[PDB]
Symmetry: C3
Subunit: 363 residues, 3 copies
């Protein structure tokens, strides 16, 4: 295996773009939504926990997520990236770039939860939770889906983190919840997330090829379909579009297309944006800062609709051989369930530990 420099370049810029989604994307997104008295604190918890996620990733996270192991977790053979030679290639890029790319995804996922709960959760409790849930939920699920684990070895399609990122975080966010002051800033964070999101979606191809290209366009497309789906729905229900309505729409589409971008046709992308846009709207019409209402609802949707629109018939890249659409759909449904239930338990364990240790508070 030899590293292609074009792929190195692409994937290093993609990692930067995903890094950009957390710092400052998600921070500015929540920063404009939450009460003003809470913004600095929230900004601090996103920053400190990003730092944290970065460190646990390098120390053992990556090895556990992407080390060869069982169906559920990797190994502790790549502790602080050792026995990864500098010139070790994975795919068509240096493994170090995989390490950095994959860590940036862990980061935005944690950032999605931490920003939602920075208000109500006590700092030390968030840190405890983050450590628990990254280790026992993000990493194992990462392994199961992208790391050769249970779900991958069963044929699950999730190009860019419909389960790993979105459903996973949405359920974490809900268990927590269970247990807008600056719209310009909200828009900026949305804009930065959207731009950074191409690093995540396109870079999930691991190379600058026809598939990254496909992921890219499907992302422009489904983000736009969703925006208009939301906006029209909002104009139907509420009489007029709103800025927050437009930004939520975009996220609904970005979320919905996340599992699907690498597998579907643009026709399929557009239909996905549309449906995710409206389901997002319906979702928030029926949970901290609507974490689930958009990420949970839309993630489930994207994941299901991937096992439809991958069909070569519907302009998709085609299912694996011997895989009927019906089998793929069951496998999607299974992946979703396994993610919902797994992130749930772990979330509950995280929040409970934090609570029995420092208390969820705040004081």
């Amino acid at each position: 295996a030899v590293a292609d420099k074009a792929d190195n370049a692409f994937m290093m810029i993609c990692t930067a773009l995903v890094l950009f989604m957390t710092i400052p994307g998600i921070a500015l997104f929540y920063g404009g939504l939450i009460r003003g008295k809470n913004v600095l604190s929230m900004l601090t918890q996103v920053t400190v926990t990003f730092a944290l996620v970065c460190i646990l990733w390098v120390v053992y996270g990556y090895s556990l997520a992407f080390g060869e192991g069982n169906n559920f977790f990797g190994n502790i053979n790549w502790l602080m990236l050792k026995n990864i030679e500098l010139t070790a290639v994975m795919g068509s890029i240096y493994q170090y770039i995989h390490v950095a790319f994959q860590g940036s995804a862990a980061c935005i996922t944690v950032g999605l939860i931490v920003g939602a709960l920075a208000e109500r959760i006590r700092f030390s409790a968030v840190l405890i939770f983050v450590v628990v849930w990254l280790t026992l939920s993000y990493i194992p699920i990462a392994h199961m889906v992208w790391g050769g684990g249970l779900l991958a070895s069963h044929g699950a399609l999730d190009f860019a983190g419909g389960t790993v990122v979105h459903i996973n975080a949405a359920i974490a966010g809900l268990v927590g919840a269970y247990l807008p002051h600056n719209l310009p800033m909200v828009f900026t964070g949305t804009a930065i997330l959207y731009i950074g999101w191409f690093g995540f979606n396109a870079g999930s191809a691991g190379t600058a090829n026809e598939i990254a290209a496909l992921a890219f366009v499907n992302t422009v497309v489904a983000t736009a379909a969703a925006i208009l789906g939301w906006i029209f729905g909002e104009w139907a229900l509420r009489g007029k579009p709103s800025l927050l309505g437009a930004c939520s729409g975009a996220i609904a589409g970005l979320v919905g297309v996340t599992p699907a971008c690498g597998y579907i046709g643009v026709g399929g992308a557009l239909i996905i944006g549309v449906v995710a846009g409206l389901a997002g709207l319906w979702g928030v019409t029926m949970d901290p800062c609507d974490v689930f209402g958009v990420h949970g609802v839309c993630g489930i949707v994207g994941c299901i609709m991937t096992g439809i629109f991958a069909a070569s018939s519907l302009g998709g890249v085609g299912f694996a051989e011997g895989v009927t659409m019906g089998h793929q759909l069951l496998v999607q449904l299974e992946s979703i369930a396994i993610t919902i239930v797994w992130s749930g338990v772990v979330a509950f364990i995280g929040y409970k530990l934090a609570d029995l240790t420092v208390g969820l508070r705040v004081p």
Copy 2:
């Protein structure tokens, strides 16, 4: 034709950077200029119409702009990108990346007009206009200049959208006009536009080659020459530089260099920044948020000065064989006129239709 992954990578990042110019670049630029009571609305119209432009592009825009057709428009053979195979190569990159790159340019152009008129134009009227003018002005002109059409087939030089983007939008903006509350935010939008602008200028080479490199440097250069041209002029006239004066200067240079970046020497870039900077200043001294004063004036200027500084004599890449500077200059002048008059008629038709349909308003 085989896709070069380095070019795929480059052009996918360039598209992201051009996407960044609209979301949130232009939005934040106007967001700080216009009255506060109008910002959210403007932010919403830029977002919703971006979504729209994205969708019309995928549906028929691209096929009409870059399909093989006549002198003026392409075909409806690539409706929803069909009969474009995934691995179809155009230039040295996948065609899908051309689709995404070219759509991001349509987006920033519409964003330039929509932001300027979000205040005074009624939403549904903007949408109607956008549809009319994208279809009948942006697309045909795109085709004429970059799509094998009338102006290209006559030797016009316009590397990165002096006519297609700037003059085109400036005239749209003027017909409309005919028919600063947050300078920090203005600066941020300027900064984001400038950074994103390298995707547009350098990526217009279609490859990561000596010409992209040339476009890049000419962009650093002419943006700086212009800033100082404006600033000094402002210090001469007004007694001191201003932040808005500095940001306008930058845009004057970015606009002025847009047609020229791929064809000229750095000596030529600097002279272009200087002249565009002062003409921009003179321009706004003598029209919504000075859309024309800078884009129209400076676009015309860049376009004219391209047919001078392309000269191999003046450090440029040289004119095509058999093309004297005098012939190039006439061809520039013709391209400008054709753009001014074409965008005018279409603009007028767009605004008139909107007016007879929903009314330009606002209520």
Copy 3:
């Protein structure tokens, strides 16, 4: 020598990212720190002096920095980049891209000083200073370190500007000093600097290779180690972390890792973030907007700790042959001293000239 397009692409995006650090990164960073009545002015001086640095670079800066010359400065043979053929290759990329990359570094360095002193220094005095100090300090030191000069030809390790950028600017900032209103904005500027910083650190490899990959990861790593080092230290001393404490932490790590990113192991990166984080904290506990407290202190630290962690023993890329760690450490110490004293004299000459010309003021 033949240009690799993957490297062209990578380095053109890296330059964009470094450009992003100044416009708007550093501007927004200082913009939120300094008094509100001073923000627009500061924003204007960063913009105008960036423009300036861009122009002097193209005119003679690059030729003086990277032209073949003596130990201390290059030549005036590349005035306005002439006798640099368009297709001239340097390393594995077009020379034009080196020109643009290296100029973007000059820009962020000047931006670091100008933002710090925009308040207290008179405009014309800043301009005079900038011209003096860029020409006589930034350029010669650039030449000495990255341009084949005294320090390089003695084996100094400074991957990405520990002396050239950080110590150099910190001493300029101190001589000047000798002679927070918006924390959300501070965070945004920090975020943008951090993201842009990967262009500087990774792009300093000149290619998208295992070393750029190494630089990248070491950057994620040391920024995170530092954030937590600062944060814990701040929690130890002040009872709780703060947003500004978190952002300063990040910068401490980014600065500290700057010389080292291309030479060390991730184990070494983490230790560097930790130590730089605390030394930054200790630094500001014991100078405009703590320019030295973080850049001077942390730069010195990174530079020293590079001559330790480069050791192949400590997971580093190894010292040059015949170079013991002890010899490298002396060479680091010498590089630092030469930089501290050189930037000092020149700074003093710059400020003194400005003072005798227009007066440091402000009026």
